[model samples]
Target: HMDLTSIQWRMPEWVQSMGGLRTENVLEYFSQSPFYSHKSNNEMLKMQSQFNALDLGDLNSQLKRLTGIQFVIIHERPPFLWVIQKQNRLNENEVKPLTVYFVCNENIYMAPNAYTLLATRMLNATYCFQKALTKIE
Candidate 1:
């Protein structure tokens, strides 16, 4: 169901070359991805397989239910990247995203809500202008 090395480079830049293990198993199908868990032997390095719903235990005290974090596999690119979205499960039909984390090369990195491109863009432009100003002075 997931293929990351089958020449699927649709948006080249989206996952462009960023230069860079094995923990396949010991987790849920949607939770511990073969491409993600193989790098670490004892649970995910930075990614927690037991979070998001980390507070679900609190819900057990009630009968009807209340709230908790639900981790979902948003994107998966075997052996390369796996993006797990942490959503606040408020109700049956109401869920909101709280955070995102991705595993690439068997390492977890926090995904920012905003694309990193903007930050790079601004910094690049600012540095460009400043570089020239230094020459004038």
Candidate 2:
């Protein structure tokens, strides 16, 4: 899942911290996250339940705990979400990896965890939503 909290931080005040860049770019992406109704709801539920258990140490166990979300750590970058399947037949010499890229603020951004990451990451991903969300308002 895309980290909403971090994106929010990138835009801190939306107008002041981000100078409007963060809000426009992030909001644009958020609007595109869910293309279908049921898919959106299911994704929300998945995020809520999994993120509720965010932590910072030893992601392996945590990842194991998060069923259905696949992630693998790389040499130096953040763990990436495993979201693609290879073709039925494979060549001994050829290799292809599934990838996702994001276009934000007119730039392409690559996150360590492209598809999913720890729940706390979400706090940073969508700082505005996580911090600004209210029950009564």
Candidate maximizing TM-score: 1
Per-residue lDDT tens digits for candidate 1, residues 39-129, read 3222232234266434333222331243455554556576666666555556553445555555665455556655334434554577678
TM-scores for every predicted model: 0.38, 0.22
The TM-score, computed over Cα atoms with residue i paired to residue i, of candidate 1 is 0.38
Tell me the deviation in Å of residue 40 in model 2: 9.7
What CA RMSD would candidate 1 show?
Answer: 17.0
**Model 2 whole-model lDDT (C-alpha atoms):** 0.33
Which ranges in model 2 have alpha carbons more than 4 Å from their true place? Answer: 1-31, 34-64, 69-97, 106-137
Best by lDDT: 1
